Design a protein that fits this description.
7% of the residues lie in helices and 29% in strands. The protein is mostly beta strands. Bound molecules: the ligand O=C(NCc1ccccc1)Nc1ccc2c(c1)[B-](O)(O)OC2 and zinc ion (ZN). The PDB classes it as lyase.
Length: 256
């Protein structure tokens, strides 16, 4: 099936998922000089104080920290959004080297990794229904640069040994996602898609301008994960990012 290798990577996805060459695919390069400030954009509202994390899962392409989304516990609203979007999971994309790893780029600059906090529009009832709608998901993207350690990320780094291979999961309760947010919530926003198959065009992207910094030891642990399942040849989970896609007929808006 699809993956990030030379024979099943991003350049091959369109064969099974034709929407890969669609009109609103992600990620994209954010040209900071061309993005336009939109004074009508409302401040973003990130309400994670009641977040209830449950489990962490290695799904063969990344690791997802899953949350209880059966009630409005952790939600994203405001900004370009109409309505309430519930946090369901977060995951990262990262590189084999500190100079690459993010999906979105800023003036062609690549960051070491990119965090995606995934939320679905409650007016659609469940995640599966939401991904079938143009305004079904809101994904908050946060860049990671290598420098100082991020204390709020250490609990995630420490449990990775327990989910080294595809299909492994571990209990992961009481994790506070507020510890992964930068100081500023200034952002860029545009309509796009999931960045892994099925590449559905159901995402309002909100990418924060301020990156968070993580230590080299922290990202090294990400790179020790495996794409393969236990007992299979070891393939390190690195470079699980899709490159920038054509912007086509879209405008990126800035909140600042
Ligand atoms: O959930 C995904 N696939 C499986 C699936 C389940 C249910 C219905 C349809 C598909 N993919 C996916 C989900 C969320 C995000 C991304 C990819 B992302 O853009 O990297 O970050 C946000
Ligand atoms: Zn992602």
């Amino acid at each position: 099936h699809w993956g990030y290798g030379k024979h099943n990577g991003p350049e091959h996805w369109h064969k099974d998922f034709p929407i890969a060459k669609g009109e609103r695919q992600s990620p994209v390069d954010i040209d900071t000089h061309t993005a336009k400030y939109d004074p009508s954009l409302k401040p973003l509202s990130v309400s994670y104080d009641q977040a209830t994390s449950l489990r962490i899962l290695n799904n063969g392409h990344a690791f997802n920290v899953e949350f209880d989304d059966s009630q409005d516990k952790a939600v994203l609203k405001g900004g370009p959004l109409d309505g309430t979007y519930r946090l369901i999971q977060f995951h990262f994309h990262w590189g084999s080297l500190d100079g690459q790893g993010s999906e979105h780029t800023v003036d062609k600059k690549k960051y070491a990794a990119e965090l995606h906090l995934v939320h679905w529009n409650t007016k659609y009832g469940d995640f599966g229904k939401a991904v079938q709608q143009p305004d079904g998901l809101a994904v908050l993207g946060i860049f990671l640069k290598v420098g100082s350690a991020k204390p709020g990320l250490q609990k995630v780094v420490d449990v990775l040994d327990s989910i080294k291979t595809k299909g492994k999961s571990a209990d992961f309760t009481n994790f506070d996602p507020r510890g992964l947010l930068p100081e500023s919530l200034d952002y860029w926003t545009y309509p796009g898609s999931l960045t892994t198959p099925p590449l559905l065009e159901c995402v309002t992207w909100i990418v924060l301008k301020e990156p968070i910094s993580v230590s080299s030891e922290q990202v090294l642990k990400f790179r020790k994960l495996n794409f393969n399942g236990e007992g299979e040849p070891e393939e390190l989970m690195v470079d699980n990012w899709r490159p920038a896609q054509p912007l086509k007929n879209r405008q990126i808006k800035a909140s600042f």
